[PDB]
């Protein structure tokens, strides 16, 4: 029979709530309290059955060993210049956290500048955001403990890497920007709250404020520069214009790519920064995004999606601000998304486009917007870039499914520009030439063509005999572009698998129209798109239902969990990482209120009607057909995940085990693993990353009985 027994989990049958006339029972609502002895006992009981299941078969050890070996390669970030020095991140291979290095010259010897590894035994203290003073002589950096979004900002004098006394607490979702006079720095902080603020609490985050910290003073002396007491969800991030004249405030409410844009000419302040600034409300609504690129006097260049879903560049003159007067510097492309733009060497613009989910990099003239040079790239993604207005060179990093990456360098003072390979590392053991990456477009239920990348060993027969790993996200205007993953390549090489990534709606692959096609009333399009990706892989012979594994994280966790409820017959295995499972209550915790722009909010009758149909927690149901059971499922979360509070996964697994786990026909396991000293994922130490992928693939291996291929 089964190899283990599911834990006893109390059902509060009195937990009933009325949603617009619809009665909803939430028997596991008590799991919403992370501090109770009841919840702690539940987590321990679940981990007690999951760990032995994952470690029983020797395949986990074989995988972990191969991952440790293959992932052990030098990892560099591209160089960036600040003041008179160069900086770059580098991990010898298996250090828990990458280290920040500094060199006084491009050819000079480098030395350790900031090593987060020495801040904890297990590498659970990580760098989260940083900002150098304009002259590059001072450095502010954020540290997060145990994977929490909470940040503590510390300071250092660059020359001699001297630690300073300045410490800023209660920082979260904060920008960091120094005024060019070198006096201090703008940052965001939240008011004091009852209970903990370490990542284990579920408390909603409201009333974020903008402060200014004068270097050499106590945080209690900080100046409040902006606040929105009547709009608790507004978040204002500050940045200084390239010439240091203006503070630009980008105010956001929710997750859509839109923002208010206010500015303050610092020279117009009566006596420096002493209180709420004299904000000029240039764009005082949430109808479009205005991303600062650079300015020349009062003429500001912004990347925008205002009446341009694929994005474009516009110049707004603060002295003649009306929309009818704006100049369109670089018009919107009919299909290619303008992902980001930077200004370098005074009058050059670096534009990065996404063409059929692949990146292109171009250099344009700032005055006219004319194309000047195309920087050639293979099929993949640009994941790093450096080069600000005063710089005379650029560095950019390229990655793809089969290559770790290449860091390029280009001296922009040269007449005939030509980038050169600055750094390149290959992984011995993974001969990229034994594999191939293809891109196909499959029709979804409504006929819309969806892109999908498929990576596999060359020459395989499309006889449906291969295990497959299909990944998706689908939301928040996030484009899922090619990236290097040793863990996935081990699945291909050592488990004979096929990798697939479906660029479903909700994402940003085809601009804001793509995004809107997967949100609110149309969120079901994401699930349909993904299910259709699975059907394609099956019909085309890459895999079969019992050999197919789907995976996603956060909004992607919601994706795969919903797909399991809707089409349990289509998948053999489902791994949902830190997923949003309770779609009726997500807005109640931490930063969840910001996601209503993609999902809607249950308080609304209309939204509730969309949400109730797909919410994973509210759609667990035994398959009607006797020959159909739920696929094997593994939920992965961590106790400091304050982005997507773990109660989502706790309640979902309790429900899966009770409604489906108790059925005689259910033989596939439904498990959860809650990690400690970890959170949503950012900053997770290498050691934990390796344990995680080892758990994932051991689960797939055991559930589908896959033999290891040495």
């Amino acid at each position: 029979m089964l190899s283990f027994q599911y834990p006893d989990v109390y059902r509060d049958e009195t937990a009933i709530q009325d949603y617009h006339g619809h009665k909803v029972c939430d028997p596991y609502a008590w799991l919403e309290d992370p501090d109770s002895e009841q919840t702690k006992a539940f987590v321990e009981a679940q981990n007690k059955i999951t760990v032995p299941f994952l470690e029983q078969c020797p395949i986990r050890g074989l995988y972990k060993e191969r991952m440790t070996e293959l992932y052990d390669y030098p990892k560099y970030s591209c160089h960036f210049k600040k003041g008179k020095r160069y900086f770059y991140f580098y991990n010898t291979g298996l250090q828990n956290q990458r280290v920040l290095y500094v060199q006084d010259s491009l050819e000079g010897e480098a030395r350790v500048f900031l090593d987060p590894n020495i801040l904890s035994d297990d590498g659970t203290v990580a760098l989260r955001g940083y900002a150098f003073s304009e002259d590059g002589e001072y450095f502010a950096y954020g540290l997060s403990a145990s994977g929490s979004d909470w940040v503590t900002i510390k300071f250092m004098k660059v020359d001699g890497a001297k630690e300073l006394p300045d410490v800023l607490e209660r920082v979260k979702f904060s920008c960091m920007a120094w005024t060019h006079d070198g006096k201090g720095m703008f940052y965001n902080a939240y008011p004091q709250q009852d209970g903990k603020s370490d990542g284990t609490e579920t408390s909603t985050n409201l009333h974020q404020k903008l402060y200014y910290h004068v270097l050499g003073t106590d945080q209690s002396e900080d100046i409040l520069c902006a606040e929105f007491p009547d709009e608790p969800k507004w978040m204002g991030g500050a940045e200084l214009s390239d010439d240091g004249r203006y503070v630009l405030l980008s105010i956001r409410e929710g997750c859509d790519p839109v923002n208010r844009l206010w500015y303050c000419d610092l020279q117009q302040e009566s006596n420096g920064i002493t209180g709420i600034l004299k904000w000029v409300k240039l764009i005082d609504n949430f109808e479009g995004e205005y991303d600062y690129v650079t300015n020349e006097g009062t003429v500001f260049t912004f990347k925008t999606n205002r009446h341009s879903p694929n994005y474009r560049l516009i110049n707004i003159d603060f002295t003649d601000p009306e929309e009818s007067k704006w100049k369109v510097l670089v018009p919107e492309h009919e299909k290619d998304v303008l992902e980001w733009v930077a200004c370098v060497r005074s009058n050059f613009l670096v534009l990065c486009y996404l063409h059929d989910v692949k990146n292109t990099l171009q250099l344009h003239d700032l005055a006219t917007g004319a194309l000047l040079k195309i920087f050639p790239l293979e099929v993949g993604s640009v994941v790093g870039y450096s080069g600000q207005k005063k710089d005379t060179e650029i560095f950019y990093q390229f990655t793809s499914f089969l290559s770790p990456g290449i860091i390029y360098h280009c001296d922009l003072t040269k007449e005939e520009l030509e980038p050169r390979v600055f750094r390149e590392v290959t992984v011995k053991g993974i001969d990229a030439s034994d594999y191939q990456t293809v891109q196909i477009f499959y029709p979804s239920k409504d006929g819309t063509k969806i892109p999908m990348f498929i990576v596999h060993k060359k020459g395989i027969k499309l006889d449906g005999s291969h295990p497959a790993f299909l990944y998706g996200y689908g939301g928040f205007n996030i484009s899922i572009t090619p990236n290097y993953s040793v863990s996935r390549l081990i699945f291909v090489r050592h488990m004979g698998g096929v990798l697939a990534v479906a660029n479903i709606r909700g994402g940003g692959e085809y601009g804001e129209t793509w995004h809107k096609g997967g949100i609110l009333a149309n969120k079901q399009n994401c699930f349909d798109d993904f299910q259709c990706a699975a059907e394609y892989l099956i019909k085309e012979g890459y895999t079969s239902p019992k050999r197919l594994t789907i995976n996603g994280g956060a909004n992607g966790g919601l994706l795969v969990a919903t797909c399991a409820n809707q089409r349990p017959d289509l998948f053999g295995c489902v791994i949902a990482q830190v997923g949003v499972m309770d779609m009726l209550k997500f807005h109640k915790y931490t930063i969840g209120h910001a996601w209503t722009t993609d999902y809607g909010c249950s308080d609304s009758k209309q939204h509730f009607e969309w949400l109730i149909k797909y919410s994973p927690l509210h759609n667990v149901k035994l398959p009607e057909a006797d020959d159909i059971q739920y696929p094997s499922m593994l939920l992965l979360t961590a106790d400091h995940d304050d982005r997507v509070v773990p109660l989502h996964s706790l309640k979902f697994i309790a429900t899966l085990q009770y409604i489906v786990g108790r059925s005689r026909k259910q033989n596939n396991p439904l498990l959860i693993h809650v990690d400690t000293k970890a959170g949503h994922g950012a900053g997770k130490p290498t050691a934990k990353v390796i344990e995680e992928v080892s758990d994932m693939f051991a689960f797939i291996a055991r559930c589908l009985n896959i033999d290891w291929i040495p």
Partner: peptide
């Protein structure tokens, strides 16, 4: 500072 359920 990316406050979405990104993963």
């Amino acid at each position: 500072x990316g406050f979405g359920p990104f993963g």
